[PDB]
Structure formats: C-alpha cells, structure tokens
Amino acid sequence: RRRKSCQ
Amino acid sequence: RRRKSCQ
Amino acid sequence: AMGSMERASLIQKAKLAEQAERYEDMAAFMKGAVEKGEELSNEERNLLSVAYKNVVGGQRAAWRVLSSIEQKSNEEGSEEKGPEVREYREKVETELQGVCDTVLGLLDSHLIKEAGDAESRVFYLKMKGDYYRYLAEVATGDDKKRIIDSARSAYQEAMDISKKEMPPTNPIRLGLALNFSVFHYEIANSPEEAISLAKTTFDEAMADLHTLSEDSYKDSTLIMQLLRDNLTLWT
Amino acid sequence: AMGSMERASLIQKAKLAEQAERYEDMAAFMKGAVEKGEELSNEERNLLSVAYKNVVGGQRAAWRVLSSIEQKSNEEGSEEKGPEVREYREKVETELQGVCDTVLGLLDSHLIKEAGDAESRVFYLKMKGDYYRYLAEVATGDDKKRIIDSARSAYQEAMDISKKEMPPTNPIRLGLALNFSVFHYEIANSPEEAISLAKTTFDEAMADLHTLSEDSYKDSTLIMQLLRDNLTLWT
Ligand SMILES: CN(CCS)C(=O)c1ccccc1
Ligand SMILES: CN(CCS)C(=O)c1ccccc1
Numbered sequence: 001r002r003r004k005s006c007q
Numbered sequence: 008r009r010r011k012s013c014q
Numbered sequence: 015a016m017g018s019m020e021r022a023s024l025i026q027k028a029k030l031a032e033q034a035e036r037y038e039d040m041a042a043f044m045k046g047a048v049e050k051g052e053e054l055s056n057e058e059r060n061l062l063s064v065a066y067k068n069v070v071g072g073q074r075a076a077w078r079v080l081s082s083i084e085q086k087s088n089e090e091g092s093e094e095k096g097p098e099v100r101e102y103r104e105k106v107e108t109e110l111q112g113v114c115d116t117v118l119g120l121l122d123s124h125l126i127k128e129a130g131d132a133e134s135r136v137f138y139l140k141m142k143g144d145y146y147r148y149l150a151e152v153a154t155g156d157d158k159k160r161i162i163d164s165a166r167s168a169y170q171e172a173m174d175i176s177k178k179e180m181p182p183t184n185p186i187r188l189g190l191a192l193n194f195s196v197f198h199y200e201i202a203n204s205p206e207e208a209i210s211l212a213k214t215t216f217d218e219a220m221a222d223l224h225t226l227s228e229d230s231y232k233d234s235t236l237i238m239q240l241l242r243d244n245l246t247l248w249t
Numbered sequence: 250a251m252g253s254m255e256r257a258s259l260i261q262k263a264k265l266a267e268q269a270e271r272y273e274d275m276a277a278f279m280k281g282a283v284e285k286g287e288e289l290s291n292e293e294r295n296l297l298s299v300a301y302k303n304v305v306g307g308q309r310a311a312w313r314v315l316s317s318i319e320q321k322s323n324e325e326g327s328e329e330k331g332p333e334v335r336e337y338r339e340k341v342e343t344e345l346q347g348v349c350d351t352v353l354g355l356l357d358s359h360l361i362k363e364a365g366d367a368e369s370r371v372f373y374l375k376m377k378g379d380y381y382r383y384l385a386e387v388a389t390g391d392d393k394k395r396i397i398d399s400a401r402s403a404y405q406e407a408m409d410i411s412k413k414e415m416p417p418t419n420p421i422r423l424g425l426a427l428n429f430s431v432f433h434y435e436i437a438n439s440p441e442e443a444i445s446l447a448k449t450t451f452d453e454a455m456a457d458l459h460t461l462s463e464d465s466y467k468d469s470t471l472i473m474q475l476l477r478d479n480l481t482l483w484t
C-alpha cells in the first residue's frame with residue numbers, strides 16, 4: 001500500500 | 008477480444 | 015521545436031496524445047503551448063499537469079526500482095557487480111531532474127507571475143511544490159535542504175492563498191493539502207504535521223459538502239477519500 | 250551512442266531497464282550490444298526481442314487509437330477539425346516505421362547472415378517477418394504489396410527451417426506459427442490459411458507433448474493456448 005498523492 | 012500474437 | 019505550430023493545434027494534439035497514452039508527446043505539446051506566452055485556461059492547466067505528472071511518474075517509479083537494486087548491491091555479502099547499477103540509476107535520475115527543471119522553468123517563465131486568480135495561482139504554486147518535492151526525493155548533496163525548503167515555501171504560499179480564497183471543498187485546495195501532507199510525511203520527516211493536515215483538511219471539507227451540487231460533491235469526496243486513505247495508512 | 254560501453258555492461262543495463270519497465274532504454278542498450286558485432290546468445294536474443302516488441306507495441310497501440318479517430322473524422326456528418334489528427338497519426342506512424350527499420354537493419358547487418366543454428370536463424374527470420382508485418386499494418390502505397398511479400402518470405406523461410414530442424418513443440422517454432430497465422434488472417438486476407446496453420450500447429454504439438462519434461466510442457470502448452478485462443482476467436 002503506497003500513500004496517495006494527487007493524480 | 009484481440010487475437011494473440013507472440014509476446 | 016513547437017514554435018511553428020499554432021497554439022490551438024498544440025492543445026488539440028495534446029488531447030490526442032492523452033487519448034493515445036503518449037504522455038511524452040503530450041508534455042512536449044503542452045510545453046509548446048505554454049511557450050506561446052498566453053495564460054492557460056483551466057482545461058489547459060489540467061492538460062499540462064496530466065502530461066508532466068505521467069512523464070515524471072514513470073521516471074520516479076523507475077528510479078525507485080533502480081535505487082532498490084543499488085541498495086541491495088551495497089549490502090554486506092553482496093557481490094561486486096561493477097558501476098553499472100549506479101550509472102543507470104544516475105542516468106534515470108538526471109533525466110528526471112531535467113523534466114522537473116523544465117516544469118519549474120515553465121512555472122517561472124512566466125506562468126506564476128501572470129496568474130492572478132486563486133484557481134490558477136494555487137494550481138501553479140502546488141505544481142512548483144510538487145516538482146521541487148520530486149527533486150527532493152532524489153537529492154543527497156549540499157543543496158538538498160534548500161530543495162526541500164523550496165518545496166515547502168511553494169506549498170505554503172499556495173496553502174495561504176487557498177485558505178483565504180477557496181472553499182474547503184475546492185478540489186485544487188484539497189489536492190494541494192493532500193500533496194503537502196505527503197511532503198510533510200515523506201520529505202520533511204514530520205509525520206504528525208502530515209496527519210494533522212490531512213485530518214483538518216478532511217474535516218473542514220466534510221462540513222462544507224452540504225453546499226455542493228451532486229457533481230461537485232462527487233469531485234470533492236473523491237479527493238477526501240485519498241486523504242482518508244493516507245490517514246488509514248499512517249495511523 | 251553506445252560504442253564506448255562494454256558489451257557486458259550493455260547487457261546488464263538492458264536487464265535493469267527491463268526491471269524498471271524502461272523499454273526504450275532497453276532497446277537502445279540491446280542495439281548497442283548487437284552493434285558490437287558478436288553473435289547473441291539465447292538469452293540475449295530474448296532481451297532484444299522483448300525490448301523492441303514493447304517499444305513497437307506501444308507505438309502500434311497509439312497508431313490504432315489515432316487511426317480510429319481519423320477514420321471517424323472522415324465520416325459523413327463529422328465536422329472538419331483541420332489537419333491535426335492526420336499530422337499526429339503520421340508522426341506516430343513515422344516513428345513506428347523508424348523502429349521497424351532499425352530492427353530490420355540489425356537483422357540485415359549482420360545477425361541473420363551469421364546465424365547458423367536453427368534456434369537463432371528461425372528466431373531472427375521470425376523477427377524479420379514480424380517487423381515487416383508491423384510495416385504492413387500501416388502501409389498504403391506503391392510498395393505495400395512488396396512489404397507484405399517481404400513479411401511472407403521471411404516467415405516462410407523460418408517455417409521451412411523450423412519444420413526440418415525443430416520438434417513441433419519447440420516454443421520458437423510455435424510462436425512463429427502463431428505469428429504467421431496472424432499474418433495470414435490480418436495482413437494477407439487469408440483467414441482459411443490462418444485457421445489451417447493454427448490447427449495443424451496445435452495438433453502436431455499436442456502429439457509431441459509426451460516427450461517433454463514438466464517445465465518444457467509448461468512452456469509449450471502456454472503457446473498452444475494462444476493458438477487455441479485465436480482458433481476460438483476465428484471460428
Ligand atoms: C481529482 N484531482 C486529482 C487528485 S488530487 C484534482 O482535481 C486535481 C487537484 C489539484 C491538481 C490537479 C488535479
Ligand atoms: C512464450 N513466448 C512468447 C509467446 S510466442 C516465446 O517463447 C517466444 C517464442 C518466439 C519468439 C519469442 C518468444
């Protein structure tokens with residue numbers, strides 16, 4: 001699980 | 008469904 | 015290289031490149047469009063962001079793969095395989111830095127200085143923070159603290175504007191907060207600040223959802239869920 | 250551009266590029282390795298093929314997206330949107346043709362002429378047929394029949410060698426038959442030949458599976474399933 005950034 | 012070629 | 019192509023044709027081809035998943039072409043077309051010297055519309059800003067985020071995202075993923083191999087290569091008991099892993103990681107790193115420098119150059123010449131409305135200014139300052147953040151991810155030398163501070167400063171200016179001029183559910187404001195929170199967690203070694211920012215952003219957006227149409231509600235709640243995903247990962 | 254890098258380092262970096270999903274880099278490294286002038290091992294031939302198949306595969310997918318948009322643009326009742334769709338399709342097409350010409354050039358200078366064992370010769374002649382097939386997919390002019398015939402001729406020489414020198418379960422033989430059958434179906438307007446070839450290839454491989462180890466059985470049956478998939482689609 002990789003943290004989310006704004007894609 | 009796309010036909011298969013050698014990948 | 016795009017100087018001879020009409021601005022409208024560059025935008026049209028950027029959209030075609032997106033449909034074809036040709037993101038390097040998309041970015042080149044949008045760079046050309048920026049260099050025409052006119053301000054970008056909301057749609058055009060989004061095209062610029064999508065193009066470069068996809069290009070650099072591929073580079074970042076490749077850099078992480080190579081960095082992990084290099085790390086394992088330098089553990090105790092590993093066999094000397096020569097300079098090749100380091101060389102190739104450095105090649106990818108230099109290409110990544112070049113893309114970040116290109117984006118930062120477009121922002122500095124002259125997108126930010128002409129951006130007066132909150133929606134454009136916050137968008138571009140967020141982008142500036144993001145590309146300094148990507149530079150910080152690979153930085154190791156004399157200027158690393160300065161790169162981190164450049165990211166921080168751009169994000170902070172964007173935050174200050176967004177809090178004054180945008181509602182707490184505005185998608186740009188939300189995405190900025192998401193990314194600044196990641197900056198705190200991953201770059202600045204400030205997990206508590208990252209968590210606090212994500213939580214307050216989420217809670218303030220939740221309280222403003224009642225003001226929104228169905229379509230705006232969908233847009234805002236999508237980004238709120240990204241904040242929640244990080245809070246669940248981090249706590 | 251790779252002339253100053255050691256052959257072994259190029260091969261090592263091609264493998265790193267594969268792990269990082271950097272297929273353009275992978276192809277450039279393998280081109281450099283071929284241009285050292287030595288024959289390729291089985292593993293190295295596979296790296297060359299993987300690299301260029303991934304590069305051209307992306308180009309072909311993009312070309313098909315753009316070609317479909319261009320087609321819709323030229324239907325009755327559609328609005329004139331200018332030359333941009335055609336121009337961009339042509340740009341992608343020219344880049345695709347360039348990659349095919351590069352691969353064909355490596356095969357002609359001098360991989361095929363030095364390939365004496367069936368495993369290498371059939372592999373390279375299959376590749377020659379494949380890259381002429383990709384050229385045929387986008388061809389429309391005076392030389393289109395000649396491009397199709399070049400693909401046919403390379404595939405036919407590979408088939409003739411493979412039937413004499415390889416067992417019917419050999420994965421190279423099977424993949425060649427799969428691709429020649431696709432050539433017949435899609436390029437040569439010969440669906441019956443395509444079906445007959447796929448069926449006889451499948452049946453002759455099935456009868457030889459009893460000779461194989463568990464690992465070879467897995468390799469051969471994987472490609473047999475691709476033949477079956479096409480037979481199910483086509484009948
Ligand atoms: C949905 N989405 C991306 C995820 S945050 C946005 O609306 C956005 C916000 C800021 C900058 C670019 C895109
Ligand atoms: C599994 N597989 C790819 C699918 S046919 C092969 O073994 C192969 C055969 C010929 C050329 C390249 C690869």
Ligand SMILES: [Cl-]
Pocket residue numbers: 101102105262
């Ligand atoms: Cl390198």
Ligand SMILES: [Cl-]
Pocket residue numbers: 027336337340
């Ligand atoms: Cl173009």
Ligand SMILES: [Mg+2]
Pocket residue numbers: 104107108
């Ligand atoms: Mg470096």
Ligand SMILES: [Mg+2]
Pocket residue numbers: 053128129130131
């Ligand atoms: Mg302005």
Ligand SMILES: [Mg+2]
Pocket residue numbers: 132179180181
């Ligand atoms: Mg406002």
Ligand SMILES: [Mg+2]
Pocket residue numbers: 339342343
């Ligand atoms: Mg053409």
Ligand SMILES: [Mg+2]
Pocket residue numbers: 288363364365366
């Ligand atoms: Mg030889």
Ligand SMILES: [Mg+2]
Pocket residue numbers: 367414415416
């Ligand atoms: Mg034999």
